[PDB]
Amino acid sequence: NAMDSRFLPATAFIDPEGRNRNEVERLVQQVVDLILAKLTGAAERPPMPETVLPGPITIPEAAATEATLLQAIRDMVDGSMNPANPGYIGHMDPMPATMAILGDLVAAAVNNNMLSLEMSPSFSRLETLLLRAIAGLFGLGEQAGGVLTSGGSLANLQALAVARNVAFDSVEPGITGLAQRPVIFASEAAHTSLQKAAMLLGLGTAAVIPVRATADSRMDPEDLRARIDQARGAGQHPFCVVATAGTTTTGNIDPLAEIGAIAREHGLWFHVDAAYGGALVFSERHRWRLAGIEQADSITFNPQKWLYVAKTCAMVLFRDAGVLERAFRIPAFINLGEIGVQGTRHADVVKLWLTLQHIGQQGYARLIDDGYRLAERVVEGVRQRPFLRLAGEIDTNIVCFRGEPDWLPAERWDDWNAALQALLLREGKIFLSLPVYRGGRWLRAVLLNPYTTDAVIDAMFKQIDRFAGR
Amino acid sequence: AMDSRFLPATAFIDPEGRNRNEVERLVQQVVDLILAKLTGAAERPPMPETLPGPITIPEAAATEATLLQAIRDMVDGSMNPANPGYIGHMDPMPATMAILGDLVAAAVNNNMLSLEMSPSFSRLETLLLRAIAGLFGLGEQAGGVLTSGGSLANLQALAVARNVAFDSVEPGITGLAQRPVIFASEAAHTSLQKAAMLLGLGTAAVIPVRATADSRMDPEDLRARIDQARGAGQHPFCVVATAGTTTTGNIDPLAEIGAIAREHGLWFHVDAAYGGALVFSERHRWRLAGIEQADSITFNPQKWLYVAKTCAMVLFRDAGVLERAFRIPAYMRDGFINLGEIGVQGTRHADVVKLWLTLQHIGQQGYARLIDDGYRLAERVVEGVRQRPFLRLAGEIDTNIVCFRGEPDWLPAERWDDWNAALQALLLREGKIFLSLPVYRGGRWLRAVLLNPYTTDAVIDAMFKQIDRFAG
Ligand SMILES: [K+]
Ligand SMILES: [K+]
């Protein structure tokens, strides 16, 4: 009735008996052609878009023309960041695997819902089985399981929610009746989704007690021990320790076995935030760096980062999946909505499973090796240059470094590194990020793009030398 | 390393064109496969024909043929809301542009975490949500963020309400000596209880207000409960009204409930996850009267605006509240606020692309027409029920949702639940018609959600003929 009417475009929906197949096929092909053109041509667009500024938006009364829509897609693509450019080396945001793109097409077309088994009969079972398999690569044991979540922040929130619920039995009565303030410990280098989660969970941001990190940005276990004693002495109630496997700024890995041993000694939930570094489970050569992770009560891991799955794709894993029934699920197989922060949720398992199959464990082991190799080339270039300083030793394919030119007052180093970052981008078409770290602005390389080469790295250093020598 | 033996030729799209031909062919095969399933969706039943073994992640790359067969299997094993007989849930066939929008989003793979990771999309999302906040009538300060589902939008609205009432961003709420509570209809969404658990309030902090026979919140009982809460030494801080209850699709009286919230100094949140779409219908939008005074609104285009999941938002009448009462005191190099700092999520998929493309292609007039046709089908179901003395309506309808059940006099009330389950199974197996069967009022009820643009009077007629045959 609506679709026959003059108030809907003939291609607004796909007629399920094929009546508008030809019109629908031509519209789809125009969008597919445009996208393939932009992506097979991605190196023609710089890593960051040229500056334009947009006016107030209006939602039209009448249907837009296919022309207007295609032009909108064109402008949206041209105005977006372009991590497919070999020069894009700044963030844990990679070009997507081909199958990941196609898996989201497939997911959106069937439009199933992870909320319940009846709404995702194929997908729910697959996600549950795949995450058991992944939990097994982490060595979490037979009872281990998890859920997919829209982002690592939600995975951290859910881990901390469970750790809180187990410590305080807070599912039904909440935590406002408490005389001792609950607190958690994390490296001073750990992700701010811990503070955001602590605020959301009613613990407040201050409940995340920072633990000293070494010169190489790894948590100091002796300091963790100190801070736990201090918390107890102050009448606080520690309930969780978060170790990070791949810190956001520097990509370093905490000493997971030692941290875990301290958490267990003190009866604290041990959560490992392996959002980035968890991908090392696919590399024989580098997997040892995660040693201790197998004793975690929970793990956060984001395939959208180092496994090249188009955003979002992240999970939280529990060593005992049964805990979600005990200390999460509200009073009322298992409909996944009941045991996640989200209810309705897009079927990320489609792009995850298709991606994992097409690249394979050996494929990831090779991508990971090549990331390390580029990273080590950056480290060597920094070592050859007295005016550059490394943040510290690297644990992953991330290198944080900055200029500390001795001919400049330190008060002007932030300006110097900001200027270098802008120049690398403008003239070298190379994007580094510029995080705040240790109270200063540092440059940050994340060597993820499979098409970044040694030549790009040598090119960056050449322009750095030219900038340094004015 | 693409040059290596260890990765398929098409694992990634070479940014200088080197595998363009191979990538095009692979992409074309999946596109053609998906179009056949969707242009052929009426041949697949609304639900798949009826356990898988443990999964193994393969060492070596899978063949393109294995991958294609996986897609075929996954689709054939999926629910199929595109079937005209799928009429059971708030889960629609996706608009064509929403499918294509997600294709575009995944291809450029930007991140809504921050402006520099989503330079065009972050500004577009902020401006579009101001525009939508304006349609809801929230005023010039109104703004919002997209979220992955309405549960997160409800979570975020209730976090902000709690933070404003208790100054809890930094110290938390463990210090409190009177328990914070919220009020909501006994018909309201369970994401309130889940949100309450997450926020540290406990599931019991959601105090249920009596609803009428038509499943609408009773403003008099809300007042009683607020009085009772304060007498019991609780601290009310928020009232949630629901515009479109999940089971029956009813709309709370937003103006009266909001008057009562404002009278008692409580945050007024409207969960318009479903019914919010009425903002695009001149003819039905009056049903939301009072919503314009809300402190916050949850709205889910993935429901009645046909945007492929997920797509939802939380809107605030004063978007500055997010800076004041949400954002943490404080990885990247205008003054614009990175959206990750003012949402529950940090990294987020660019849902704005399918939303904006869909809104433009359907337009306000298209939605008004879609909504009308939904009310027409629902009214046809209501009429069918009225004619059959063995069927009972749950109550008056407010949206395109109809909850009803068999209560046949010739069977004892104790057997009604099994009668209705068996009818639901029958409609599905014989009729190829899917109705959901929620628990409501301690009973099993049938539930029709009349969303598919291709559901016709004839589908409804067939459902009633199967019901008649079953009852005879
Ligand atoms: K150096
Ligand atoms: K009747």
What is the rounded distance in angstroms from the CA atom of residue B395 to the CA atom of residue B381?
A: 13
Q: Is B270 left (phi over 0), alpha (psi -120 to 50) or beta?
A: beta
Residues A123, B78: C-beta atoms closer than 8 Å:
yes
Domain around A15: 1-111+348-470
As given in the structure block, the two tokens for residue B301 are 């285009």
Q: Which amino acid belongs to residue A237? A: H
Q: What is the CATH number of the domain that holds A206?
A: 3.40.640.10
* Closest by Cβ to B190, choosing from A165, A171, A330: A330
Burial A172-183 (b: 16+ CB within 10 A, else e): eebbbebeebbb
Is B392 in CB contact (< 8 Å) with chain A? no
What is the rounded distance in angstroms from the CA atom of residue A394 to the CA atom of residue A374?
A: 12
CB B48 within 8 A of CB A121: yes
| Co-location of A195 and A318 in the same domain | yes
Minimal Cα–Cα distance from B182 to chain A, Å?
13
Q: Is B203 left (phi over 0), alpha (psi -120 to 50) or beta?
A: alpha
- Quick check: helix, strand or coil at residue A117? coil
Per-residue CA distances from B198 to A237, A296, B192, B318 (Å): 19, 22, 10, 24
H or E segment at A317?
A: strand A314-318
Beta bridge partner(s), residue B267: B238
Is B324 in CB contact (< 8 Å) with chain A? no
Nearest CA-CA partner of A158 in A148, A173, A169: A148
List the strands of the sheet with B401-406, edge to edge: B391-393, B401-406, B446-449
Nearest CA-CA partner of B37 in B3, B72, B84, B85: B72
CB A127 within 8 A of CB A351: no
| Co-location of A237 and A119 in the same domain | yes
CB burial of residue B88 (10 Å; 0-12, 13-18, 19+): buried
Residue with tokens 């200390």: A327
Residues A345, B60: C-beta atoms closer than 8 Å:
no
**Ligand 2: centre distance to CA B464 (Å):** 12
| Co-location of B361 and B440 in the same domain | yes
Minimal Cα–Cα distance from B204 to chain A, Å?
5
SS3 labels along chain B: CCCCCCCCCCCCCCCCCCCHHHHHHHHHHHHHHHHHHHHCCCCCCCCCCCCCCCCCCCCCCCCHHHHHHHHHHHHHCCCCCCCCCECCCCCCCCCHHHHHHHHHHHHHCCCCCCHHHCHHHHHHHHHHHHHHHHHCCCCCCCEEEEECCHHHHHHHHHHHHHHHHHCCCCCCCCCCCCCEEEEEECCCCCHHHHHHHHHCCCHHHEEEECECCCCCECHHHHHHHHHHHHHCCCEEEEEEEEECCCCCCCECCHHHHHHHHHHCCCEEEEEECCHHHHHHCCCCHHHHCCHHHCCEEEECHHHHCCCCCCCEEEEECCCCHHHHHCCCCCCCCCCCCCHHHHCCCCCCCCCHHHHHHHHHHHHHHHHHHHHHHHHHHHHHHHHHHHHCCCEEECCCCCCCEEEEEECCCCCCHHHHHHHHHHHHHHHHHCCCCECECCEECCEECEEEECCCCCCCHHHHHHHHHHHHHHCC
Cα-only R_g, chain A: 24
| Co-location of B329 and B202 in the same domain | yes
What is the rounded distance in angstroms from the CA atom of residue A300 to the CA atom of residue A158?
A: 10
- Of A298, A329, A347, at which residue does a domain stop? A347
Cβ count within 10 A of residue A22: 11
As given in the structure block, the two tokens for residue B244 are 């479109």
As given in the structure block, the two tokens for residue A70 are 């295609």
Cβ count within 10 A of residue B40: 15
Q: Which amino acid belongs to residue B260? A: I
CB B456 within 8 A of CB A1: yes
Residues B118, A80: C-beta atoms closer than 8 Å:
yes
Is B99 in CB contact (< 8 Å) with chain A? yes
As given in the structure block, the two tokens for residue B231 are 């007498």
What is the rounded distance in angstroms from the CA atom of residue B194 to the CA atom of residue A443?
A: 41
Kindly report the backbone phi and psi dihedral angles of residue B211, in degrees, each rounded to the nearest multiple of 5, phi listed first: -115, 155
CB A26 within 8 A of CB B94: no
Q: Among A307, A358, A373, which would you mutate to test the B interface (most chain B Cβ atoms within 10 Å of its Cβ)?
A: A358
Half-sphere exposure of B360 (CA within 13 A, CB side): 21
The residues, any chain, with a CB within 8 Å of residue A35's CB and separated by 6 or more, are A73, A77, B103, B104, B107
CB A106 within 8 A of CB B67: no
CB B125 within 8 A of CB B114: no
| Co-location of A186 and A273 in the same domain | yes
What is the rounded distance in angstroms from the CA atom of residue B15 to the CA atom of residue A155?
A: 32
| Co-location of B148 and B242 in the same domain | yes
* Closest by Cβ to B149, choosing from A5, A61, A343: A343
Cβ count within 10 A of residue B26: 22
What is the rounded distance in angstroms from the CA atom of residue A115 to the CA atom of residue A90?
A: 35
Is A168 in CB contact (< 8 Å) with chain B? no
As given in the structure block, the two tokens for residue B129 are 């949500």
CB burial of residue A150 (10 Å; 0-12, 13-18, 19+): buried
**Ligand 2: centre distance to CA B436 (Å):** 19
* Closest by Cβ to B59, choosing from A49, A137, A360: A360
Q: DSSP string covering A26-66, please?
A: HHHHHHHHHHHHHHHTGGGS-SSPPP---------SSPPPH
Strand A208-211 relative to strand A237-244: parallel, antiparallel, unpaired? unpaired
**Ligand 2: centre distance to CA B32 (Å):** 47
| Co-location of A48 and A146 in the same domain | no
H or E segment at A270?
A: strand A269-273
Nearest CA-CA partner of A359 in A95, A130, A97: A97
Nearest CA-CA partner of A207 in A226, A225, A234: A234
Terminal-residue alpha carbon distance, chain B: 68
Resolution (Å units): 1.9
Interface of B with A in 283-312 (CB under 8 A): 300, 302, 306, 308-310, 312
Q: Among A38, A71, A81, which would you mutate to test the B interface (most chain B Cβ atoms within 10 Å of its Cβ)?
A: A81
Which residues on A lie below 8 Å from B48 (Cβ)? 121-122
State the sign of the Cα–Cα–Cα–Cα dihedral B128, B131, B136, B142. Answer: positive
Cα-only R_g, chain B: 24
As given in the structure block, the two tokens for residue B235 are 């601290």
The residues, any chain, with a CB within 8 Å of residue A387's CB and separated by 6 or more, are A403, A404, A405, A406, A468
Half-sphere exposure of B159 (CA within 13 A, CB side): 34
Residues B453, A13: C-beta atoms closer than 8 Å:
yes
As given in the structure block, the two tokens for residue B127 are 């401006």
What is the rounded distance in angstroms from the CA atom of residue A460 to the CA atom of residue A446?
A: 13
| Co-location of A135 and A190 in the same domain | yes
H or E segment at A403?
A: strand A398-403
Cβ count within 10 A of residue B382: 15
How many separate domains does chain B show? 2
Nearest CA-CA partner of B349 in B406, B308, B296: B308
Residues B360, A118: C-beta atoms closer than 8 Å:
no
Find the farthest-apart pair of alpha carbons in chain A and give their distance in angstroms, rounded: 75
User: Which residue of chain B comes nearest to A70, CA vs CA?
Assistant: B357
- Of A296, A328, A347, at which residue does a domain stop? A347
Orientation of helix B20-39 relative to helix A21-40, angle to 10°: 150
Q: Which ligand is nearest to the CA of B381?
A: 2
Kindly report the backbone phi and psi dihedral angles of residue A28, in degrees, each rounded to the nearest multiple of 5, phi listed first: -55, -40
Is A210 in CB contact (< 8 Å) with chain B? no
Strand B391-393 relative to strand B312-316: parallel, antiparallel, unpaired? unpaired
Nearest CA-CA partner of A46 in A74, A93, A82: A82
CB A263 within 8 A of CB A270: yes
Interface of B with A in 51-80 (CB under 8 A): 51-62, 66-67, 70-71, 73-75, 77-80
Q: DSSP string covering A78-92, please?
A: HTS--TTSTTB-SSS
| Co-location of A342 and A357 in the same domain | no
As given in the structure block, the two tokens for residue A357 are 């199959």
Which residues on A lie below 8 Å from B205 (Cβ)? 174
Residues B120, A332: C-beta atoms closer than 8 Å:
no
Residues B362, A12: C-beta atoms closer than 8 Å:
yes
Per-residue CA distances from B5 to A100, A350, A447, B11, B196 (Å): 21, 25, 21, 12, 52
Residue with tokens 């040693």: A291
| Co-location of B47 and B140 in the same domain | no
Residue with tokens 């909440």: A174
CB burial of residue A387 (10 Å; 0-12, 13-18, 19+): middle
| Co-location of B195 and B317 in the same domain | yes
- Of B350, B377, B410, at which residue does a domain stop? B350
Strand A298-301 relative to strand B391-393: parallel, antiparallel, unpaired? unpaired
Terminal-residue alpha carbon distance, chain A: 70
* Closest by Cβ to B78, choosing from A14, A29, A122: A122
CB burial of residue A78 (10 Å; 0-12, 13-18, 19+): middle
As given in the structure block, the two tokens for residue B206 are 């959601």
**Ligand 1: centre distance to CA B437 (Å):** 68
Which residues on B lie below 8 Å from A198 (Cβ)? 172
Residues A80, B170: C-beta atoms closer than 8 Å:
no
Q: Is A360 left (phi over 0), alpha (psi -120 to 50) or beta?
A: left
Nearest CA-CA partner of A377 in A273, A455, A451: A455
CB burial of residue B378 (10 Å; 0-12, 13-18, 19+): buried
Interface of B with A in 395-434 (CB under 8 A): none
Nearest CA-CA partner of B182 in B104, B269, B112: B269
Kindly report the backbone phi and psi dihedral angles of residue B240, in degrees, each rounded to the nearest multiple of 5, phi listed first: -110, 120
Find the farthest-apart pair of alpha carbons in chain B and give their distance in angstroms, rounded: 75
CB A301 within 8 A of CB A280: no
What is the rounded distance in angstroms from the CA atom of residue A273 to the CA atom of residue A283?
A: 18
| Co-location of B163 and B278 in the same domain | yes
Q: What is the CATH number of the domain that holds A416?
A: 3.90.1150.170
What is the rounded distance in angstroms from the CA atom of residue A459 to the CA atom of residue A454?
A: 8
The residues, any chain, with a CB within 8 Å of residue B325's CB and separated by 6 or more, are B160, B163, B164, B169
* Closest by Cβ to B103, choosing from A101, A151, A177: A101
∠ CA A124-A130-A133, rounded to 5°: 145
